[PDB]
Amino acid sequence: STWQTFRRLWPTIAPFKAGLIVAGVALILNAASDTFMLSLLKPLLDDGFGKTDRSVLVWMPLVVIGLMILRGITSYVSSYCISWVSGKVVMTMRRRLFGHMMGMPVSFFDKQSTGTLLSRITYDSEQVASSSSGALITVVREGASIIGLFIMMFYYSWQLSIILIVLAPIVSIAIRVVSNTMGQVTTSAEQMLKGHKEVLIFGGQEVETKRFDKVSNRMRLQGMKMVSASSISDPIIQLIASLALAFVLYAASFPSVMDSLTAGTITVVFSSMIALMRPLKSLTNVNAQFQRGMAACQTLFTILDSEQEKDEGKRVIERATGDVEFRNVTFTYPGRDVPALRNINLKIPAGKTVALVGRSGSGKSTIASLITRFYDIDEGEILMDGHDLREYTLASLRNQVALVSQNVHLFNDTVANNIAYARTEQYSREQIEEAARMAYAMDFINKMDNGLDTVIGENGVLLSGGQRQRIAIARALLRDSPILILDEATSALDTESERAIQAALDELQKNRTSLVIAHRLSTIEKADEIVVVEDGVIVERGTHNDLLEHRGVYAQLHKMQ
Amino acid sequence: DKDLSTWQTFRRLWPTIAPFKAGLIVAGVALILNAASDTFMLSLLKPLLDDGFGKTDRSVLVWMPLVVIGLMILRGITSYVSSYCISWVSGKVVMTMRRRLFGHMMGMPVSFFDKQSTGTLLSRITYDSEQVASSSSGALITVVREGASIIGLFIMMFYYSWQLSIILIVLAPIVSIAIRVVSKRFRNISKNMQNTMGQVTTSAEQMLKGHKEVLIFGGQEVETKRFDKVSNRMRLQGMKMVSASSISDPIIQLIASLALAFVLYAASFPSVMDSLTAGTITVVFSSMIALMRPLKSLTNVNAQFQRGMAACQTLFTILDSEQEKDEGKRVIERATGDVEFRNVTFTYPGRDVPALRNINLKIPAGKTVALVGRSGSGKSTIASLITRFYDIDEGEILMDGHDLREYTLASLRNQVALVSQNVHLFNDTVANNIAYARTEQYSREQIEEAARMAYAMDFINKMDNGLDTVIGENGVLLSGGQRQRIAIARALLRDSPILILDEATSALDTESERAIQAALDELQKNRTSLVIAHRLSTIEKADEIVVVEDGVIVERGTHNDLLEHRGVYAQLHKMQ
Numbered sequence A: 001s002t003w004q005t006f007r008r009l010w011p012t013i014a015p016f017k018a019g020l021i022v023a024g025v026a027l028i029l030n031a032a033s034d035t036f037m038l039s040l041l042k043p044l045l046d047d048g049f050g051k052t053d054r055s056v057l058v059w060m061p062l063v064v065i066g067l068m069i070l071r072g073i074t075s076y077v078s079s080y081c082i083s084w085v086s087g088k089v090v091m092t093m094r095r096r097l098f099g100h101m102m103g104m105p106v107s108f109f110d111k112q113s114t115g116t117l118l119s120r121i122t123y124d125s126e127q128v129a130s131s132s133s134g135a136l137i138t139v140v141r142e143g144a145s146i147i148g149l150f151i152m153m154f155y156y157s158w159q160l161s162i163i164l165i166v167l168a169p170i171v172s173i174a175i176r177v178v179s180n181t182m183g184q185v186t187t188s189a190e191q192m193l194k195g196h197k198e199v200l201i202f203g204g205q206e207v208e209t210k211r212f213d214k215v216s217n218r219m220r221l222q223g224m225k226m227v228s229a230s231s232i233s234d235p236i237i238q239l240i241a242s243l244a245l246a247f248v249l250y251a252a253s254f255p256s257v258m259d260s261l262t263a264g265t266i267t268v269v270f271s272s273m274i275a276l277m278r279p280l281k282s283l284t285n286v287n288a289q290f291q292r293g294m295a296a297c298q299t300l301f302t303i304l305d306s307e308q309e310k311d312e313g314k315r316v317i318e319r320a321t322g323d324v325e326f327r328n329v330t331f332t333y334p335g336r337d338v339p340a341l342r343n344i345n346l347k348i349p350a351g352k353t354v355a356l357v358g359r360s361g362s363g364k365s366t367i368a369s370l371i372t373r374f375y376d377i378d379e380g381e382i383l384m385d386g387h388d389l390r391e392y393t394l395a396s397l398r399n400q401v402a403l404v405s406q407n408v409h410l411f412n413d414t415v416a417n418n419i420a421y422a423r424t425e426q427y428s429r430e431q432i433e434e435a436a437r438m439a440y441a442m443d444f445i446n447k448m449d450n451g452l453d454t455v456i457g458e459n460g461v462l463l464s465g466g467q468r469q470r471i472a473i474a475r476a477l478l479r480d481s482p483i484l485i486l487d488e489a490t491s492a493l494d495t496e497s498e499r500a501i502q503a504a505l506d507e508l509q510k511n512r513t514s515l516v517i518a519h520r521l522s523t524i525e526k527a528d529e530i531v532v533v534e535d536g537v538i539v540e541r542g543t544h545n546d547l548l549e550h551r552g553v554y555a556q557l558h559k560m561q
Numbered sequence B: 001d002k003d004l005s006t007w008q009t010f011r012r013l014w015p016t017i018a019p020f021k022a023g024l025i026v027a028g029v030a031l032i033l034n035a036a037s038d039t040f041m042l043s044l045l046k047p048l049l050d051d052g053f054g055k056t057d058r059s060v061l062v063w064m065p066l067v068v069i070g071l072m073i074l075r076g077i078t079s080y081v082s083s084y085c086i087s088w089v090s091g092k093v094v095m096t097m098r099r100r101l102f103g104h105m106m107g108m109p110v111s112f113f114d115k116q117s118t119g120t121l122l123s124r125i126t127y128d129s130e131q132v133a134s135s136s137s138g139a140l141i142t143v144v145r146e147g148a149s150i151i152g153l154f155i156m157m158f159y160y161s162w163q164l165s166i167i168l169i170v171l172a173p174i175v176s177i178a179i180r181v182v183s184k185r186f187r188n189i190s191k192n193m194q195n196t197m198g199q200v201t202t203s204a205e206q207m208l209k210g211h212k213e214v215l216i217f218g219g220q221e222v223e224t225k226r227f228d229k230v231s232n233r234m235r236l237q238g239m240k241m242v243s244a245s246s247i248s249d250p251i252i253q254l255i256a257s258l259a260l261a262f263v264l265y266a267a268s269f270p271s272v273m274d275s276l277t278a279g280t281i282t283v284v285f286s287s288m289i290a291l292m293r294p295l296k297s298l299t300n301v302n303a304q305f306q307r308g309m310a311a312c313q314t315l316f317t318i319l320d321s322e323q324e325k326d327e328g329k330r331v332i333e334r335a336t337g338d339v340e341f342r343n344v345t346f347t348y349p350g351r352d353v354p355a356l357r358n359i360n361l362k363i364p365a366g367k368t369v370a371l372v373g374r375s376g377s378g379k380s381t382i383a384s385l386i387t388r389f390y391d392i393d394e395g396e397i398l399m400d401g402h403d404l405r406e407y408t409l410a411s412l413r414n415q416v417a418l419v420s421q422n423v424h425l426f427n428d429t430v431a432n433n434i435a436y437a438r439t440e441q442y443s444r445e446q447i448e449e450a451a452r453m454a455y456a457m458d459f460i461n462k463m464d465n466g467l468d469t470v471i472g473e474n475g476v477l478l479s480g481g482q483r484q485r486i487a488i489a490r491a492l493l494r495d496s497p498i499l500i501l502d503e504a505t506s507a508l509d510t511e512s513e514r515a516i517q518a519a520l521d522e523l524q525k526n527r528t529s530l531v532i533a534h535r536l537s538t539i540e541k542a543d544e545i546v547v548v549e550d551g552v553i554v555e556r557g558t559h560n561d562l563l564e565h566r567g568v569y570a571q572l573h574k575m576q
């Protein structure tokens, strides 16, 4: 599979192969430079030390510098080439994953953590390029290094080289033979921090301290274990290699071997045996790093194979000044088969407010999800302006609907652009300031240092749940969407300046198709039609006179609130 | 400047490290020997090429292999030991630091916690407490080991051919400055990428998190366009990161190489080389080549070390932060339970409208008061004050005739029980949640009946392992109606004299709410209670009902009495 993963990847790389092939040449030459420099080491001792002043002056210092210049350039070139390519493919895959994930359905987003998906973008893409680049570099240059070194070794003393060779199998096998709580740490600290208030009033300081003590000590020993394991592996490896060499030098004792040697040649031969010790290390490990790179890549490719939400509606409607009708609708969450909704018909007539109230258990919220077609439905139909929602392309329908809630997520931008999110160009700031004014956001805003152009960004998080909601109104207002989905289930139960919010929302709800998941009494009373939801079905509905005496469970709910 | 800053930081840290001083001692000794091993293997390089090439077969044969192996043994051992002691010392120093931080954050104010998303805290303490040990370990290691070797190597160079050694000295300063200059021009830009990687992170995270809002509002192009820029900038930065090392490294090696070349060139001249041999030329030059690695490490440590002490300092700023104000000195065990507010005014910090202006309510021992009002008044806030999560600004809150602030927070908070729907369910067994921090003090039979008296056993008996079923995992298993009865089960067991009941967030929509109502009746007969009331039941039986708006009590009385008066209370009754 791993090479099958790679060949799927190669297309994204192929456009940049040119950088690879130049990088390859540069790597080869660097190995050549390093081999060539040990070559020089023979003349310095034989020719150089055989009473020749000329050698130690010209050939050595000037060539060594010459070679150093070539060593630097080539390394610079290869680094730049690799970096460039590595940067190019990392960027490309990050952009595909970003676009792909944004297009997925919300079902996709419920499965995985937002941190996991983010981890894919930041880390897993740079890792695959990293590991493959390291793999390629290691192969090419370390490949070149060892054959250049072995040639040279054999050339000046083939006897010793063939000794060393016959020992390589043994050394290879011997080197083979010796070669979670952190989550609990984060968990332990995090769970104390989530339960700080509870900890304070039951006096749970002692038990949490001991709990952390236990976890923190377990990880200390676990973290020690890994360091200790790594520590012993290589001391033996070098010991074993050393043995092989000790034996090689032992061989030099015998006249048959030694007579072909000088001070210069024996020096280079051993020098090149030690030079080998790192290439061989890198080349044994190359396959491992290549594997882990391809494992991350196949993860990415898994995500990229997942289907994005289907948008086959070919109908556009520029504005909906019309009702939404539900026809015998049933909907089930993917993953379980106890339907959140079973047979729902409700008519939000164009321009009037419908508030639906329900128990926490019921899917009052799921209805609101459905109209915006975050999830598609199992049975029945939803028609907006008489056409089924599915007949419309998603952009137009979603443009029709606006959402307002305490938990609408804020982008790190100028408050003004947050209000005119995704339509900064279209809306003149004159409007923006007005919409922020009407939603009674403006008093809180002007306290900011930059005001509207101040950014709630870079994790500043100056705003609070109450303040955000008034921006959500401002956003929905300014855009002037034909339909309102307003969620009050997020409790927001200890507000400071709720009056502002209420007047804002009345303005917003006015003469605007408003569908409301309501927990608040003012919205309830002034809604035109009220609908009760118990589990998956509409139990009853009631208007003004109907409100006074509930056929449904309004009385019991009214007592609660 | 930073020399001083880091060494004040290090002195602060030392007390934590000194109890493991033995580990550091031994590691340093082993490191010296490790460096000595390398020196001695180069010393062998001379007899190999002089006595071994003066037709003495003994040297090469009988003992050149054996001495080498022996030293490589020693080297390996010394290596393992030193690693062992360091890892050992590092582990505990890290662990002890984490314990201190954990213990310190536990005692921090509530406002502090609300403000900072604990991810940063959490992230900081794990990551930064490791990074201070890792950097300080590496700094020590290189100093001792690389310091030992360069001395040993420099001495060796003088013993054989002192002439060459000194040529390298005088060159060493001009080289050092040149190397230092090069290094400072190019490679101190790690943070540069950090800023751009943050932008990458930020844009990815907010699309991932705010995906639904993107879909609704049309953020596709804008959010893609934003990501397009930042990814390119990140990419370019990584190249700059790479490029910095690419340019620095051979230029630096070139510089050192020219010094060496000059030493070599000087060796041609008869004055120095006459005394030299093939043995001692190679040992001297090999040693010069050896030196390059240690010298590189040493210059880089002060950067390495400053990185460690910086992380230490950030931890110390958390340690320096102020804990909960706790000057009471007064402990009371099972306070009778009457709470009086006098002229209490309270504004949440960093807001400019008081949550409560001039509250006076007296709650007699054993009796319940219902705080009911329009949503957004300070009935919820008042609850928070008795536990002294926040101190009032003006006035005083009395518990049994003394200000809460004269009481130890501990004793003060053991008097107060809390019962609400949003109680936290620690990851544990049901038994251990009810007797949350007193598992050693309450018997099973004690726990079993507390749960029974809270009408909770109907949904406990249906669990997998019943009362010892493990609940938690973000409180997933339990529901709001079930949580109240667990919160009640705690209050009953502890039998705290002051109850704070919050039905605001409670769900009256519960198949078993009459059972929650029975548990409440049995919960509050004996003790003083302060109910943020929203249920017909509790307001019916309540002793006093106080109406709050804009943090002001606007009327008081009995239920029947108040409805007779037909003031603010009745209008709330008239609607629902």
Ligand SMILES: *O[C@H]1O[C@H](CO[C@@H]2O[C@H](CO[C@]3(C(=O)O)C[C@@H](O[C@]4(C(=O)O)C[C@@H](O)[C@@H](O)[C@@H]([C@H](O)CO)O4)[C@@H](O[C@H]4O[C@H]([C@@H](O)CO)[C@@H](O)[C@H](O[C@H]5O[C@H]([C@@H](O)CO[C@H]6O[C@H]([C@@H](O)CO)[C@@H](O)[C@H](O)[C@@H]6O)[C@@H](O)[C@H](O[C@H]6O[C@H](CO[C@H]7O[C@H](CO)[C@@H](O)[C@H](O)[C@H]7O)[C@@H](O)[C@H](O[C@H]7O[C@H](CO)[C@@H](O)[C@H](O)[C@H]7O)[C@H]6O)[C@@H]5O)[C@@H]4O)[C@@H]([C@H](O)CO)O3)[C@@H](O*)[C@H](OC(=O)C[C@@H](CCCCCCCCCCC)OC(=O)CCCCCCCCCCCCC)[C@H]2NC(=O)C[C@@H](CCCCCCCCCCC)OC(=O)CCCCCCCCCCC)[C@@H](O)[C@H](OC(=O)C[C@H](O)CCCCCCCCCCC)[C@H]1NC(=O)C[C@H](O)CCCCCCCCCCC
Residues within 6 Å of the ligand: A034, A037, A038, A040, A041, A044, A060, A064, A134, A137, A238, A241, A242, A245, A246, A249, A267, A270, A271, A272, A274, A275, A276, A277, A278, A281, A282, A285, B038, B041, B042, B044, B045, B048, B068, B245, B253, B257, B260, B261, B264, B281, B282, B283, B285, B286, B289, B290, B293
């Ligand atoms: O290159 C260079 O270097 C090198 C070094 O070395 C070695 O080492 C070792 C060790 O080391 C280490 C350690 O420490 O360990 C290692 C490494 O690594 C690794 C690892 O991993 O481990 C390894 C492997 O495995 C591989 O694989 C690798 C790869 O790469 C991978 O991939 O890896 C490293 O480290 C590392 O590690 C780490 C980890 O571990 C973790 O911790 C990592 O991480 C890191 O990394 C980093 O990096 C980066 C940077 O740095 C950059 O880089 C780049 O690149 C790369 C690559 O690829 C490239 O290629 C890449 O990869 C990268 O990427 C980049 O791109 C940075 O940046 C980064 O950062 C990042 O990262 C991270 C990651 O992650 C991580 O994390 C965690 C923690 O932290 C963990 O856990 C994980 O896992 C991980 O992954 C990231 O992450 C980060 O970040 C991120 O993330 C985070 C988160 O957390 C954060 O931060 C954020 O978020 C983000 O950002 C970042 O940061 C990184 O860091 C590290 O680094 C290293 C380092 O680097 C350092 O620095 O280290 C050791 O052991 C060794 O050693 C020693 O010391 C030495 C020796 C001893 C001595 C003694 C001797 C004795 C003798 C005796 C004799 C006898 C007689 C008697 O040793 C050895 O071994 C030895 C022993 C053995 C024994 C044997 C036996 C004996 C017996 C015998 C028998 C006979 C008898 C007779 C070392 N070494 C070696 O190898 C060796 C050598 C030495 C030297 C020499 C000496 C002297 C002596 C003589 C004797 C004679 C005899 C006869 O050698 C040789 O070869 C020799 C030959 C020559 C000789 C001559 C003679 C003459 C005489 C005179 C006469 C006249 C080296 O190696 C090299 O070298 C070689 O190789 C080369 C060639 O070969 C050579 C050539 C030369 C030539 C010359 C001519 C001469 C003649 C002349 C004529 C006249 C080097 N190069 C050199 O060296 C230098 C050159 O050469 C210069 C030249 C100049 C010349 C002058 C002229 C002259 C004039 C004239 C005058 C005369």
Ligand SMILES: C[C@H](Oc1ccc2ncc(/C=C/C(=O)O)c(C3CC3)c2c1)c1c(Cl)ccc(N)c1Cl
Residues within 6 Å of the ligand: A164, A165, A167, A168, A169, A171, A172, A175, A237, A240, A241, A242, A244, A245, A273, A274, A276, A277, A278, A280, A281, A284
């Ligand atoms: C005879 C001996 O043959 C092997 C064969 C395979 C090896 N495969 C891996 C490794 C190292 C792995 C690691 O370090 O993780 C080594 C050791 C030389 C470094 C190997 C040595 C050998 C060779 Cl051919 C070349 C140079 C030296 N000096 C030695 Cl002894």
Ligand SMILES: C[C@H](Oc1ccc2ncc(/C=C/C(=O)O)c(C3CC3)c2c1)c1c(Cl)ccc(N)c1Cl
Residues within 6 Å of the ligand: B168, B169, B171, B172, B173, B175, B176, B179, B252, B255, B256, B257, B259, B260, B288, B289, B291, B292, B293, B295, B296, B299
């Ligand atoms: C004369 C010359 O003096 C310095 C002095 C300070 C140095 N300080 C740092 C570095 C490296 C820094 C780095 O790599 O970041 C070097 C280079 C030799 C490696 C230095 C060289 C020198 C010396 Cl005394 C010893 C051995 C060699 N061979 C050389 Cl040239």
